């Protein structure tokens, strides 16, 4: 936090915490599935999947493979988007709306698309 | 499809759109199925995939 | 002749043939023979049913808040909980007959009125 | 690492055995619950028949049959399992329940929760939505006593204390062993359906009033039995899925254990022959 700021650090640590809890639950996810978790952990997993997919991005170099053009997300927008994600502000959108999306505005666009 | 195929076997029911995707994939996979020693010229491959 | 179908909400209890069926409906005591006009009647809270059929002994049923439907062919008794006389624990009936709860007391009285008490 | 993989293999084998046993037990209990539904059907048919006759001889003005002037509140009876391992079952119910709420919210009626099942009770306890009353311990094997209690509470709330102007039941219909769908039914006010073309004692109106609560109790009982059968079917499917996942995990862990075993043998041979080749 002395370097990137506490707004950035807090969001990054919350994201890492959510993903670590998801990795810990991976065993139950593999055998039984999301359904048998506790409600707290179920919500955590449902937003952990969305955080994991939102970390994906349509890279510029990917244009030769996907055909889609690439996108650049400024750091402030990334911090705000992941802060919203960790707080649950996007738990209603489908998970696929986060694949290779690269931004809040384009996320809303794809959510409208689906 | 190949993710939806596994998902469907255990879901009680699926959306009409999901069933449409399943039925399209079950035909695409059969389309790509091909016998041995029977290569297709790109002229026939494009039509088959079409 | 009549075929008496005592059917509970959970399961069917009895479906044998019968010649006469007697029970205390909310309008008084009623007896039904074959070809009785179609009828629907609510049994009283402590209603008991007595079935007379060819050969076998009279069959007494404790009925909890049942309904009696005389039909062209079947007299169907729909019951919440129905107990034959053979299934009655007499001491339990005697104890329950004095219960404070109105429904429990009515059910105990129905069990007794079947028990011959 | 190989020790961890062997332990994981043992764990997955034990879980495979347990889930396989649960799958077979769930098949047997599907059979039992469906047999109970079949046993309960004839009473429902006959009570519906006599209700139709009474209605044909009734004014149809009982409160259960007429829409409140301004519905400001509505009851929702969510039927849910009291034990887990049923896969999406509870969620499929609960999601539908919330869908119904979104409708009720859009219609200006705030839902009031009545919950049957421990899982739905926890579901709502975490979302802090207050349940007025909850019943538990009979979703696996319901009895008409529980259904009568539920129906009496719901009907008393409808007649009313704040009370409700409407009540729905959300439960998982079992249509076939493959299909189990959460549906929401409005169980009051009932709508009269004129389908087109007897005596009563003392009068058909009093019999109608005494029978409508009984009919609602019977329908709640049928819904609970349907939910139990659907719960057992979902448990069978979820346990089959868990058994398949455990078998796949056992296969993957066996491949990993074999790779680690070969790697350890090769590493040991490398150390031994490096020591010989030095000496």
Curated annotation (Swiss-Prot), chain A:
<comment type="subunit">
    <text>F-type ATPases have 2 components, CF(1) - the catalytic core - and CF(0) - the membrane proton channel. CF(1) has five subunits: alpha(3), beta(3), gamma(1), delta(1), epsilon(1). CF(0) has three main subunits: a(1), b(2) and c(9-12). The alpha and beta chains form an alternating ring which encloses part of the gamma chain. CF(1) is attached to CF(0) by a central stalk formed by the gamma and epsilon chains, while a peripheral stalk is formed by the delta and b chains.</text>
</comment>
<protein>
    <recommendedName>
        <fullName>ATP synthase subunit beta</fullName>
    </recommendedName>
</protein>
<comment type="similarity">
    <text>Belongs to the ATPase alpha/beta chains family.</text>
</comment>
<comment type="function">
    <text>Produces ATP from ADP in the presence of a proton gradient across the membrane. The catalytic sites are hosted primarily by the beta subunits.</text>
</comment>
Swiss-Prot record, chain B:
<protein>
    <recommendedName>
        <fullName>ATP synthase subunit alpha</fullName>
    </recommendedName>
</protein>
<comment type="similarity">
    <text>Belongs to the ATPase alpha/beta chains family.</text>
</comment>
<comment type="subunit">
    <text>F-type ATPases have 2 components, CF(1) - the catalytic core - and CF(0) - the membrane proton channel. CF(1) has five subunits: alpha(3), beta(3), gamma(1), delta(1), epsilon(1). CF(0) has three main subunits: a(1), b(2) and c(9-12). The alpha and beta chains form an alternating ring which encloses part of the gamma chain. CF(1) is attached to CF(0) by a central stalk formed by the gamma and epsilon chains, while a peripheral stalk is formed by the delta and b chains.</text>
</comment>
<comment type="function">
    <text>Produces ATP from ADP in the presence of a proton gradient across the membrane. The alpha chain is a regulatory subunit.</text>
</comment>
Swiss-Prot record, chain C:
<protein>
    <recommendedName>
        <fullName>ATP synthase epsilon chain</fullName>
    </recommendedName>
</protein>
<keyword id="KW-1003">Cell membrane</keyword>
<keyword id="KW-0066">ATP synthesis</keyword>
<keyword id="KW-0406">Ion transport</keyword>
<dbReference type="InterPro" id="IPR036771">
    <property type="entry name" value="ATPsynth_dsu/esu_N"/>
</dbReference>
<keyword id="KW-0139">CF(1)</keyword>
<keyword id="KW-0375">Hydrogen ion transport</keyword>
<dbReference type="GO" id="GO:0046933">
    <property type="term" value="F:proton-transporting ATP synthase activity, rotational mechanism"/>
</dbReference>
<dbReference type="InterPro" id="IPR001469">
    <property type="entry name" value="ATP_synth_F1_dsu/esu"/>
</dbReference>
<dbReference type="GO" id="GO:0045259">
    <property type="term" value="C:proton-transporting ATP synthase complex"/>
</dbReference>
<dbReference type="Pfam" id="PF02823">
    <property type="entry name" value="ATP-synt_DE_N"/>
</dbReference>
<dbReference type="InterPro" id="IPR020546">
    <property type="entry name" value="ATP_synth_F1_dsu/esu_N"/>
</dbReference>
UniProtKB/Swiss-Prot annotation, chain D:
<dbReference type="GO" id="GO:0046933">
    <property type="term" value="F:proton-transporting ATP synthase activity, rotational mechanism"/>
</dbReference>
<keyword id="KW-0406">Ion transport</keyword>
<comment type="subunit">
    <text>F-type ATPases have 2 components, CF(1) - the catalytic core - and CF(0) - the membrane proton channel. CF(1) has five subunits: alpha(3), beta(3), gamma(1), delta(1), epsilon(1). CF(0) has three main subunits: a, b and c.</text>
</comment>
<comment type="similarity">
    <text>Belongs to the ATPase gamma chain family.</text>
</comment>
<keyword id="KW-0139">CF(1)</keyword>
<dbReference type="GO" id="GO:0042777">
    <property type="term" value="P:proton motive force-driven plasma membrane ATP synthesis"/>
</dbReference>
<dbReference type="GO" id="GO:0005886">
    <property type="term" value="C:plasma membrane"/>
</dbReference>
<keyword id="KW-0375">Hydrogen ion transport</keyword>
<dbReference type="InterPro" id="IPR035968">
    <property type="entry name" value="ATP_synth_F1_ATPase_gsu"/>
</dbReference>
<keyword id="KW-0813">Transport</keyword>
<dbReference type="InterPro" id="IPR023632">
    <property type="entry name" value="ATP_synth_F1_gsu_CS"/>
</dbReference>
<keyword id="KW-1003">Cell membrane</keyword>
């Amino acid at each position: 936090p002395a370097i990137v700021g506490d707004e950035h650090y807090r969001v990054a640590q919350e994201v890492i915490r959510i993903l670590q809890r998801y990795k810990d639950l991976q065993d139950i996810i593999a055998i039984l599935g999301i359904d048998e978790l506790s409600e707290e952990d179920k919500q955590l997993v449902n937003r952990a999947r969305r955080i994991e997919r939102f970390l994906s991005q349509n890279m510029m170099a990917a244009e030769q493979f996907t055909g889609q053009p690439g996108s650049t997300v400024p750091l402030k927008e990334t911090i705000e988007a992941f802060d919203k994600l960790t707080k649950g502000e996007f738990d209603h959108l489908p998970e696929q709306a986060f694949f290779l999306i690269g931004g809040l505005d384009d996320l809303a666009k794809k959510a409208e698309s689906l | 499809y190949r993710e939806l195929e596994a998902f469907a076997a255990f879901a009680s029911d699926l959306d009409a759109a999901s069933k449409a995707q399943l039925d399209r994939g079950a035909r695409l996979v059969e389309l790509l199925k091909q016998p041995q020693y029977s290569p297709l010229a790109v002229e026939e491959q494009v039509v088959a995939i079409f | 002749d009549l075929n008496v179908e005592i059917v509970a909400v959970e399961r069917e209890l009895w479906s044998g043939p019968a010649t006469f069926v007697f029970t205390r409906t909310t309008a008084g005591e009623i007896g039904i023979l074959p070809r009785h006009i179609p009828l629907v009647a609510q049994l009283v809270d402590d209603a008991m049913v007595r079935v007379e059929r060819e050969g076998e002994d009279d069959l007494r049923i404790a009925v909890d808040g049942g309904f009696l439907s005389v039909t062209e062919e079947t007299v169907r008794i729909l019951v919440e909980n129905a107990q034959f006389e053979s299934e009655i624990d007499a001491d339990a009936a005697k104890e329950d007959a004095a219960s404070d709860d109105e429904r429990t007391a009515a059910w105990g009285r129905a069990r007794l009125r079947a028990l011959g008490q | 690492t190989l020790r961890e993989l062997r332990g994981r293999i043992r764990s997955a084998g034990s879980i495979k055995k347990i889930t396989k046993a649960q799958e077979l037990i769930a098949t047997s209990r599907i059979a039992k619950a469906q047999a109970r539904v079949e046993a309960a059907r004839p009473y429902a048919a006959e009570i519906t028949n006599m209700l139709t006759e009474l209605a044909g001889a009734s004014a149809l003005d009982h409160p259960l049959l007429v829409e409140r002037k301004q519905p400001k509140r509505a009851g929702v009876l969510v039927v849910s399992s009291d034990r887990g391992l049923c896969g999406a079952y509870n969620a499929n119910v609960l999601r539908r329940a919330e869908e119904l709420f979104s409708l009720l919210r859009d219609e200006g009626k705030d839902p009031v929760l009545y919950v049957v099942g421990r899982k739905a009770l926890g579901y709502f306890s975490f979302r802090q939505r207050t349940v007025v009353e909850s019943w538990t311990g009979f979703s696996e094997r319901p009895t008409y006593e529980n259904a009568r209690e539920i129906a009496d509470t719901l009907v008393n709330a409808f007649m009313a204390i704040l009370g409700v102007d409407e009540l729905h039941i959300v439960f998982t219909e079992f249509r076939s062993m493959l299909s189990q769908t959460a549906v929401a039914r409005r169980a009051a006010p009932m709508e009269v359906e004129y389908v087109g073309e007897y005596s009563f004692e003392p009068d058909p109106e009093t019999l109608f009033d005494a029978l409508l609560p009984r009919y609602i109790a019977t329908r709640v009982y049928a819904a609970l039995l349907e939910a139990a059968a659907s719960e057992s079917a979902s448990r069978r499917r979820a346990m089959k899925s868990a058994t398949d996942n455990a078998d796949d995990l056992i296969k993957a862990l066996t491949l990993a254990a074999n790779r680690e075993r070969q790697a350890q043998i090769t590493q040991e041979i490398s150390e031994i022959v490096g020591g010989a080749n030095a000496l």
